[PDB]
Ligand binder design. Structure first.
Ligand SMILES: [Ca+2]
Lengths: 116, 115
């Protein structure tokens, strides 16, 4: 599993469950092509987005649907989504974990990158 | 000043100076229309991006060119840029400050909206 996303809720001190995540890959015409998507589990994690084969080198955008998460909890948020944009696999396959720590008017995002 | 952007460097504990910042407004066709841009000052701040008359309700994207900032310092970065996408909503709080706290493999962003 070469791309994983983990999301935490900093208001309630819990994993952020059922958060929609969309991944896009920058296409040759500079548009964003849908690549993969899913929802976080009860642990706040989203596994199984892609495979080593499918996950070619390129520029990827991970969009985390934070606004819907806050709306479901009955909280007024500021951001539409959290966005993480990065070049992946430029020197061969790597494994990427994108974390997002969410508050209504702020978020933090970190990447952990490991070599298989 | 309806909109200000402040950028900080969490490796050296300093303002992030001469960082390119681009703001876009979402158009009816869902494309991103250039709205304002500039480079951060010696204080890490970018003022004078827009006026009250120009800054209408809608969805805005702030793209901060972090990759160019780190690479020039000789430090290898992860992100292409930092992105902040938000809805501007008319109410009492009318001055928006978007702050970005930068590290090579992470960033934090907060918004302060005051009256
Ligand atoms: Ca390459």
């Amino acid at each position: 599993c070469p791309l994983m996303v983990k999301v935490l809720d900093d208001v309630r001190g819990s994993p952020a469950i059922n958060v929609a995540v969309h991944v896009f890959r920058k296409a040759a015409d500079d548009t964003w092509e849908p690549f993969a998507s899913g929802k976080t589990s009860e642990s706040g994690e989203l596994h199984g987005l892609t495979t080593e084969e499918e996950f070619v080198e390129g520029i990827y955008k991970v969009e985390i649907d934070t606004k819907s998460y806050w709306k479901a909890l009955g909280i007024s948020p500021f951001h539409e989504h959290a966005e993480v944009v990065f070049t992946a696999n430029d020197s061969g396959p790597r494994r990427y974990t994108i974390a997002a720590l969410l508050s209504p008017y702020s978020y933090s995002t970190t990447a952990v990158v490991t070599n298989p």
